[PDB]
Structures are given as C-alpha cells and as structure tokens.
Amino acid sequence: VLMVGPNFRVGKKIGCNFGELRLGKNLYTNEYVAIKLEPMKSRAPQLHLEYRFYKQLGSGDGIPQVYYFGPCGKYNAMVLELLGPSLEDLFDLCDRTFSLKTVLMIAIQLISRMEYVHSKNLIYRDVKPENFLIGRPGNKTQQVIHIIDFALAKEYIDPETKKHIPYREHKSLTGTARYMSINTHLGKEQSRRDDLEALGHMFMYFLRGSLPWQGLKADTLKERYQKIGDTKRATPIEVLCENFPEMATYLRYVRRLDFFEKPDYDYLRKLFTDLFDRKGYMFDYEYDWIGKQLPTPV
Numbered sequence: 001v002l003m004v005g006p007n008f009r010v011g012k013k014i015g016c017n018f019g020e021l022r023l024g025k026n027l028y029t030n031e032y033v034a035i036k037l038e039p040m041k042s043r044a045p046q047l048h049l050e051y052r053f054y055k056q057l058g059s060g061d062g063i064p065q066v067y068y069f070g071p072c073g074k075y076n077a078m079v080l081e082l083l084g085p086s087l088e089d090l091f092d093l094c095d096r097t098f099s100l101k102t103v104l105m106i107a108i109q110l111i112s113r114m115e116y117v118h119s120k121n122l123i124y125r126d127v128k129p130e131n132f133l134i135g136r137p138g139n140k141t142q143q144v145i146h147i148i149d150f151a152l153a154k155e156y157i158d159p160e161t162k163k164h165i166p167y168r169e170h171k172s173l174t175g176t177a178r179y180m181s182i183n184t185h186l187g188k189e190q191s192r193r194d195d196l197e198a199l200g201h202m203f204m205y206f207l208r209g210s211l212p213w214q215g216l217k218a219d220t221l222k223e224r225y226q227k228i229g230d231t232k233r234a235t236p237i238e239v240l241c242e243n244f245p246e247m248a249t250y251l252r253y254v255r256r257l258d259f260f261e262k263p264d265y266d267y268l269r270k271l272f273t274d275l276f277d278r279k280g281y282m283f284d285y286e287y288d289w290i291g292k293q294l295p296t297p298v
C-alpha cells in the first residue's frame with residue numbers, strides 16, 4: 001500500500017529489520033519520517049503498547065516525536081521522527097572504542113534521559129547501543145542522544161494505588177544479555193536501578209571496546225544468560241573499571257540500590273561532570289564520530 005494515514009507516503013525498507021522499518025514522507029509538510037510496521041497477524045504484538053508508552057512519555061528532550069499510529073494494509077504502523085545513526089552504528093565507525101570525553105557526553109545525557117523516563121512512571125528495560133540514536137542535522141538535534149524502542153517498558157508506579165510495583169522473582173529472561181543488570185539475570189523484577197546499571201555496562205563496553213562476558217555461548221538461551229550473569233558476578237568492579245574510577249563508583253552505587261529506591265540522578269551526573277571538568281574537556285558535542293561519513297537513508 002502506498003500510504004499510511006492521511007498523509008504519509010510509504011517508501012523503501014531502511015536500516016540493516018526485514019521490512020519492519022521503512023522510510024516515509026509526510027506529503028503535507030515535505031518532511032521525511034520513519035515508519036515502523038508490525039504484521040496484524042503477529043503472535044506477539046508490541047507496537048500498539050509501544051505507542052501507548054510514547055503517549056505516557058509525552059514530548060521530551062531526546063524522545064522522538066510520534067506522529068501517527070494506525071493500519072497500513074495488513075500491518076499496524078507507527079510513524080515517528082526520523083533520527084540519525086545509533087550509537088552501535090557510530091561505535092563501528094569509530095573502530096569500536098569511544099574516548100572518555102565522548103562516553104561522558106553520552107553518559108551525562110543518558111542519565112537525564114533515564115531520569116525523564118522514570119519521572120513518567122516508566123522503566124525502560126532495553127538498554128543497548130542500538131536503541132540510542134543521534135538526531136538529523138535538519139532538525140538541529142544531530143548533537144542530541146535520543147532513546148528509542150519502548151516495547152519492553154513497564155509502568156513501575158501502579159496508576160490507581162500510586163504504589164511502586166511489588167518485588168518479585170521468577171521473571172522470564174528475554175532482554176539483551178550483554179548489558180543487563182546482575183539482578184535481571186537472577187530473575188528479579190526490574191526497577192529503576194536496573195536501567196542505570198545496564199547504562200553503566202554499556203558505558204564500559206564503549207570505553208573498553210568489549211565486555212569480558214561478551215563471547216559466552218551455551219546450548220540453551222537460559223544456560224547462556226546464566227553463564228553471562230555468573231561472569232558478571234565473578235568480575236570485580238575494580239577490574240572491569242580499571243582506569244576509570246568514576247565508572248567504578250557509578251557501578252557500585254547502582255548495583256547497591258534497593259529495589260524500591262529512587263536513584264540520586266544528581267549525584268551520578270556530578271560524578272561525571274566533575275570528572276569531565278577535571279580532565280579539561282569542553283562539552284562542545286565534538287564526539288569521536290564528528291567528521292566521519294554517517295550512514296543515511298536520505
């Protein structure tokens with residue numbers, strides 16, 4: 001089908017997706033957009049719930065604008081702001097290490113981004129470099145690290161009672177193993193702490209080039225998650241974060257948060273801004289990838 005909604009032309013498949021993602025164009029405004037498609041026959045629908053989480057988030061810094069949700073042939077479609085490459089794309093472009101300055105510019109932003117999500121009574125639960133995208137130059141947000149992919153989010157404040165969700169265990173594992181928190185591996189209900197811990201793992205991935213549990217395989221997914229969690233538990237923070245004392249402090253702090261506890265986001269930002277200033281860095285958005293040829297759908 002040629003169109004989604006009144007005004008969005010459906011274009012080519014984009015990204016490296018299987019038809020899940022297309023370029024689109026708002027014919028009414030002469031603007032490109034991203035079109036996410038999900039078959040109506042899906043045995044595990046996620047797109048409509050994702051749209052509802054975007055409505056709960058509302059308009060925010062580093063959150064893509066969402067323009068439409070509705071049918072498109074035999075698909076449900078969500079039309080959203082077209083962003084730039086992901087941090088994983090950019091990491092590859094930068095030979096799979098980022099400088100401390102780039103990691104800190106990312107980290108300072110992403111602590112705030114997670115604070116925003118948490119302020120809207122949601123936990124994110126899908127931290128990975130693929131889900132953080134820079135903007136496009138055309139919208140003056142190419143410097144801003146955005147967060148996408150809210151299909152795995154959850155409301156952590158129950159809306160009627162206004163109580164934090166209860167602690168429980170035996171939660172099935174499905175996420176991304178590489179970044180997930182130790183408590184996620186143990187089958188615990190995720191909470192605010194776990195989003196911040198997964199961010200810490202991702203920051204160390206960027207700094208080191210890899211994480212020491214990244215290569216582990218097993219005959220079953222469950223066994224693989226187990227081995228990865230075992231390695232996370234067996235790798236001292238002082239070792240993982242050798243040469244990055246503030247990252248060690250960050251990770252120890254988030255690992256030690258209680259399930260119900262509100263993180264001190266101010267404290268975590270200050271760890272990193274104090275470090276940033278002490279190193280003489282200037283917060284000028286000159287990330288490692290500036291000056292390189294970025295992948296673009298057009």
Ligand SMILES: COc1ccc(/N=c2/[nH]c(N)c(C(=O)c3ccc(OC)cc3)s2)cc1
Nearest residue numbers: 014015017021034081082083084085295297
């Ligand atoms: C490297 O090629 C591309 C670079 C940037 C790009 N922009 C996007 N903007 C979005 N809002 C996107 C998404 O919502 C999205 C949707 C699905 C998806 O599946 C892996 C990945 C990203 S991709 C899409 C493709």
Ligand SMILES: [Cl-]
Nearest residue numbers: 030031032138
């Ligand atoms: Cl445009």
Ligand SMILES: [Cl-]
Nearest residue numbers: 108109112113
């Ligand atoms: Cl920010």
Ligand SMILES: [Cl-]
Nearest residue numbers: 178213214215
């Ligand atoms: Cl991995």
Ligand SMILES: [Cl-]
Nearest residue numbers: 101280281282
């Ligand atoms: Cl600098």
Ligand SMILES: [Mg+2]
Nearest residue numbers: 060063064065
């Ligand atoms: Mg915006």
Ligand SMILES: [Mg+2]
Nearest residue numbers: 126130131149
């Ligand atoms: Mg995903």
